[PDB]
Design an enzyme around this catalytic site. Sequence first.
Site, PDB file in Angstrom:
ATOM      1  N   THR A   1       0.860  -1.223   0.000  1.00  0.00           N
ATOM      2  CA  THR A   1       0.000   0.000   0.000  1.00  0.00           C
ATOM      3  C   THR A   1       0.884   1.257   0.000  1.00  0.00           C
ATOM      4  O   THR A   1       1.840   1.310   0.787  1.00  0.00           O
ATOM      5  CB  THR A   1      -0.945  -0.008   1.208  1.00  0.00           C
ATOM      6  OG1 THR A   1      -1.720  -1.210   1.177  1.00  0.00           O
ATOM      7  CG2 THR A   1      -1.852   1.207   1.240  1.00  0.00           C
ATOM      8  N   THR A   2       0.599   2.208  -0.884  1.00  0.00           N
ATOM      9  CA  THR A   2       1.207   3.554  -0.900  1.00  0.00           C
ATOM     10  C   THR A   2       0.078   4.561  -0.822  1.00  0.00           C
ATOM     11  O   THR A   2      -0.775   4.519  -1.708  1.00  0.00           O
ATOM     12  CB  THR A   2       1.949   3.848  -2.200  1.00  0.00           C
ATOM     13  OG1 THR A   2       2.915   2.823  -2.417  1.00  0.00           O
ATOM     14  CG2 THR A   2       2.608   5.207  -2.155  1.00  0.00           C
TER      15      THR A   2
END
Lengths: 228, 229
Positions: free
Chosen positions: B1-2
């Site tokens: 996840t970013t």
Amino acid sequence: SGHDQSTDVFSAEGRVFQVEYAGKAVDNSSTAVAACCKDGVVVAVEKVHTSRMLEKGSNNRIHAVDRQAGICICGLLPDGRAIVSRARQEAENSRDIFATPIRGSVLANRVGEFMHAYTTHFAYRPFGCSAIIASYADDGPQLFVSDPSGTVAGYYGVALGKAKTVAKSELEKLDFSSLTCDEAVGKLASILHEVHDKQKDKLYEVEVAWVCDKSDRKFVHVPADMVP
Amino acid sequence: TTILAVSYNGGVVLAADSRTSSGTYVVNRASNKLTKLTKKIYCCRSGSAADTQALAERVSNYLGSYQTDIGAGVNVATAANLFQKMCYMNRWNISAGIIVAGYDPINGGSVYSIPSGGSCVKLDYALGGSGSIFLYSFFDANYKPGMSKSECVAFCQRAVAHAYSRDGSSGGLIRTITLDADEPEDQTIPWNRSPYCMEKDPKYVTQATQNQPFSSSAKITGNRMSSTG
């Protein structure tokens, strides 16, 4: 005869008698007066002292609820403090949970729903006092009166107590668009001096409190030099 | 996840990858990690999809109730302090790394990192999720506060890309959303037109010289690419 013993009971005319009765406890109590300005809001209340020997700030009718909001009780003082103790619990729930000063509009409505819950169930009796909530949060300066029924209503100027009638005539002579928080202290305190019966209640003082751009939108008792 | 919020003058931009992996397999390719709490107050969601979704809905509900009864807009603070309390109460059970960003008329563009512990840190810009760790250096270098709304979006996209290009966990679409005085502008950059990717960058065209033919000379040439050569 049974139509008035509890608050859980409408009469045939459709009114709760126990609430009108608690409302009579407000209209035999010490007169309170308040005035919403552009600058902020002012609450004065005459405290009728029973004994000559009381300290200064005994039976304090005006209480800070939050930084920006204070109640001024008029009616049965002890009941009123239960309101204040609640209003507080709500005002700090607003800071704890929702990270903001409680709006005055909300705080009044939160206090109304509290005073109302005691007009519904048989177990409870309605509150003996009106509360005068005076806030200055982000919704501007706000003045509100929660009466025993739980009926909130916003006011510019308001009078409660046994002089309510004559003290309201004198609040109508003021121009609310114009007056500042510094004039108002003098005029409300001037009103409570004028209406107060000199023969019935010999021992009395005029506790005044405000919240305005003067006091840093912080709700405090005004110093004892501004009062007369 | 970013994920990442950044504030510009008027308001904020959230930006996110769109990949939720069960480790090494990509379960969903096109997840919205930007989750509306109110009209103008979006949270980004890192960590267990379940737990952030359950918290996003639980908070979006209280802000709805609040917004009704106060008869006014919600301060972003309010959204972040609700989200801190719920991330904090359960900090042991859940695995949730949140960014509440948004606009209210009082404070303007506010961004709060609520990482795992249930800390709550008002900032100029927050990075969350696996692919945060890549950006920190990238921000320190290329971020320059006092950007226009346009640049802050074009930047965040560039950033989310630099991250999802190095992180395995992160990848796919770069969803942004700008929250200011005007009506929320979401846009979804598909991978095929992303601002940066290692595949299309000319740095990494020329292959590493690993394979290397059987030669009579220590002189490294290129890889062996035909059996005939």
